[PDB]
């Protein structure tokens, strides 16, 4: 049976918006994805992406109503849609590297992730991330266990706003779980301004910080070297005091040189978000969209087997405003930030 | 060549759009009722598929001038006379066209209004008013409405302006112009990219074009933008596809910037000449890409007998979230209530 509900975290009453698909809704979504996989080259080929926002309207109406409520909820942490069909037998083993992960068997899940994502905005990728793929792959890679990348395992992926340094950072990060046998969690935290000193909040609204590109990062790539060496003074909080946006990276954010008050406010915020971290576990066929304007995210330490049974998610970036990044894209329809 | 994208509705597609608009009119009070606007994006998806396909092509075309949907059903007899003032233009009979404008608009983005335009109505009215003939507002007639980016002064200016023509018996043209950067050359383009201009609010944001009972403080932001305009660019984004932000009556170069004043002078003559006509007949709805084109309206003689030209107008944003600092609360659509 279909159900939807609001799951609170701390004082965030609509932190998590959860939708459970009925079996007919799951079947309808799967049929649409399979039809797209029959009619279009790739989940992020130009032919499909030109049509993606119209085809997304063919998803179940009850689900579209709930996704639309999430899209306009400026206090959302995560929209979670549970109960999509994943045929584990037909999917086959978890690939050993993202370079081997754009498989024929998994295409239908890429298509479905783009269809859900296109209800929230327009899908984008990054030239420096998994060869500029829009639908990317999150799976453990042997040798990457202790790194601060999505392919890590043994070491906690430190929490951050996705692409925090960038004015073109996504509005949503989408995750479609294909398999997660050991129930490994995405970590999530938002700011509760009622748990932080108003003076600290005032400081975080100041353009008193440097957010440098993470290592996962030419007119465009000139700005990337400049962002490292001569970072612009930016705020961590922006917008309305009642609904501030958050932009911070637990490993790549500093106060401006000599701004001790700003250094203090930043470490107060880092301790607050560290303490407020909670978890979202996506079983097979569960999809989450994190509101990247409101939450930082990471991933818990876990034990990868590297035997083809490991955790595997499809991942996507979504923007509310594709047009605003045109200076960083190759042409009108191209979705790859930093391609030209 | 596809700067103007036209969809002519078949009778069935027109019928389907009308039935959806009437279903909305039966359910909700106003075409900008909060409950309707919450539901609008999903209801918009019930518009004809062929129409949604062409609107989506328009939405992602970053060189679009206007999407024009021709041949919506307008029952002229049932609509009754053109109101003599926008304040009186929220008529029972015209509600269905307000709802339909929002449904089309909600395929392109989220609808917004302004605290300082027609009392913060999201669906506004464009009709001639006695005493406004020679003004630079939408209710003018005798004097050409000078071309402009809608709300050029504001960082929260719309991505699309929607115009639903209810009535246009004398085929009065909307005017449109984009910038071809190649046709003006990289020298002027480089100047127009500089934060070297002042863009002040147009006269529609003044207390004289709102109800007298509206709070003085709604206008504080507008008056500040008139007295002390920020230094801003006219062009932004990619050199291959730059966005345009300029107003023929309210844009100046910053004091002492002779090179900027020259570049502005060149741009005005370029846009003024290329300025071309789109006639919206009854049932025609246009969405102007406000990032790409300035627009205006040709001069005409109003009859003031209830038969005059009448458009419904709406502002559309690609990104409602970005203006949250200027809105009362999450769902509120009226810019400048904060
Ligand atoms: O593995 C996860 O659950 C989250 C992935 C992630 O943090 C990321 O790639 O952005
Ligand atoms: O009357 C027209 O066609 C244009 C109206 C307009 O430019 C406006 O009201 O903003
Ligand atoms: Fe206008």
B95 within 8 A of B32, measured Cβ to Cβ: no
- Rounded distance, CA A183 to CA A281, Å? 6
B246 within 8 A of B271, measured Cβ to Cβ: yes
- Rounded distance, CA A50 to CA A68, Å? 21
In sequence order, the β-bridge partners of residue B276 are B176
Annotated binding-site residue? A169: no
* A1 lies within 8 A of chain B by CB: no
SS3 of chain B: CCCEEEEECCHHHHHHHHHHHHHHHHHCCCCCCHHHHHHHHHHHCCCCHHHHHHHHHHHCCCCCCEEEEECCCCCHHHHCCCCCCHHHCCCCCCHHHHHHHHHHHCCCCEEEEECCCHHHCCCEEECCCCCCCCCCCCCCCCCCEEEECCCCCCCCCCCEEEEEEEECCCCCEEEEEECCHHHHCHHHHHHHCCCCEEECCCHHHCHHHCCCCCCHHHHHHHHHHHHCCCCECCEECCCCCCEECCECCCEEECCCCHHHHHHHHHHHHHHHHHCEEEECCCCCEEEEECCCEEEEECCCCCCCCCCCCEEEEEEEECCCHHHHHHCCCCCCCEECCC
Contacts for B150 with CB less than 8 Å, ≥ 6 apart: B157, B158, B161, B288, B290, B295, B315
A250 DSSP 8-state letter: T
Kindly state if the Cβ of B163 falls inside 6 Å of ligand 2.
Answer: yes
- Rounded distance, CA B259 to CA B257, Å? 5
- Rounded distance, CA B334 to CA B121, Å? 8
Residue A307 buriedness (CB in 10 A; 0-12 / 13-18 / 19+): exposed
Chain B hits for A322, Cβ within 8 Å: 60, 318
Give the H or E element holding residue A266: helix A260-276
Phi, psi of B66 (to 5 degrees): -155, 140
- Rounded distance, CA B282 to CA B129, Å? 19
Token pair for A73: 């909820």
| CA dihedral sign of residues A103, A105, A107, A110 | negative
- Rounded distance, CA B295 to CA B280, Å? 13
Residue A266 buriedness (CB in 10 A; 0-12 / 13-18 / 19+): buried
Closest Cα in chain A, distance from residue B35 (Å): 11
Pairing mode of beta strands B66-70, A237-238: unpaired
Kindly state if the Cβ of A299 falls inside 6 Å of ligand 1.
Answer: yes
Residue B255 buriedness (CB in 10 A; 0-12 / 13-18 / 19+): exposed
Q: Do A320 and B322 touch (CB under 8 A)?
A: yes
Q: Do B321 and A293 touch (CB under 8 A)?
A: yes
| Mutation for testing the B interface, residue in A327, A333, A335, A337 having most B CBs under 10 Å | A327
Q: Do B52 and A50 touch (CB under 8 A)?
A: no
- Rounded distance, CA A35 to CA A308, Å? 28
- Rounded distance, CA A13 to CA B320, Å? 22
- Rounded distance, CA A32 to CA A64, Å? 14
Ligand 1 atom with the smallest distance to the CA of A149 is 9
- Rounded distance, CA A186 to CA A80, Å? 12
In sequence order, the β-bridge partners of residue B21 are none
| CA dihedral sign of residues B302, B303, B304, B307 | negative
**Which residue in the set B42, B56, B237 is minimally distant from A54, CB to CB?**
B56
Q: Do B62 and A323 touch (CB under 8 A)?
A: yes
Distances (CA, A) of B179 to A8, A162, B62: 50, 35, 13
A112 within 8 A of A84, measured Cβ to Cβ: yes
- Rounded distance, CA B192 to CA A168, Å? 23
Distances (CA, A) of B169 to B282, B305, B307: 8, 13, 8
């Amino acid at each position: 049976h279909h159900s939807s509900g609001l799951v609170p975290r701390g004082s965030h009453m609509t932190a998590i918006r959860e939708i459970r698909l009925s079996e007919p809704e799951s079947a309808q979504a799967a049929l649409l994805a399979l039809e797209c996989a029959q009619r279009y080259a790739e989940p992020d080929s130009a032919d499909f992406l030109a049509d993606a926002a119209v085809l997304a309207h063919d998803l179940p109406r009850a689900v579209r109503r709930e996704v639309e409520r999430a899209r306009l909820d400026d206090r959302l942490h995560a929209l979670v849609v549970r109960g999509n069909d994943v045929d584990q037998d037909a999917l086959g083993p978890t690939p050993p590297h993202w370079r081997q992960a754009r498989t024929a068997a998994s295409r239908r899940y890429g298509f479905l992730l783009v269809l859900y994502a296109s209800l929230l905005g327009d899908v984008v990728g990054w030239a420096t991330q998994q060869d500029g793929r829009v639908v990317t792959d999150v799976l453990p890679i042997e040798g990457q266990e202790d790194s601060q990348v999505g392919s890590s395992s043994s070491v906690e992926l430190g929490w951050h706003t996705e692409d925090a340094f960038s004015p073109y950072r996504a509005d949503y990060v989408g995750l479609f779980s294909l398999r997660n046998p050991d129930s490994v969690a995405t970590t999530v935290a938002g700011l509760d301004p009622d748990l932080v000193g108003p003076a600290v909040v005032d400081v975080l609204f100041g353009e008193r910080f440097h957010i440098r590109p993470d290592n996962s990062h030419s007119d465009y790539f000139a700005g990337i070297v400049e962002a490292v060496e001569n970072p612009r003074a930016v705020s961590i909080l922006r917008g309305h005091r009642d609904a501030p946006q958050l932009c911070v990276d637990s490993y790549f954010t500093t106060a401006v040189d000599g701004d001790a008050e700003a250094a203090g406010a930043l470490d107060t915020l880092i301790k607050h978000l560290g303490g407020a971290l909670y978890e979202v576990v996506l079983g097979p066929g569960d999809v989450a969209f994190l509101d990247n304007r409101n939450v930082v995210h990471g991933r818990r330490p876990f034990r990868a087997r590297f035997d083809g049974t490991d955790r595997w998610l499809k991942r996507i970036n979504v923007t509310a405003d594709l047009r605003k990044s045109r200076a960083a894209r190759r042409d009108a329809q191209a979705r790859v930030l930093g391609e030209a």
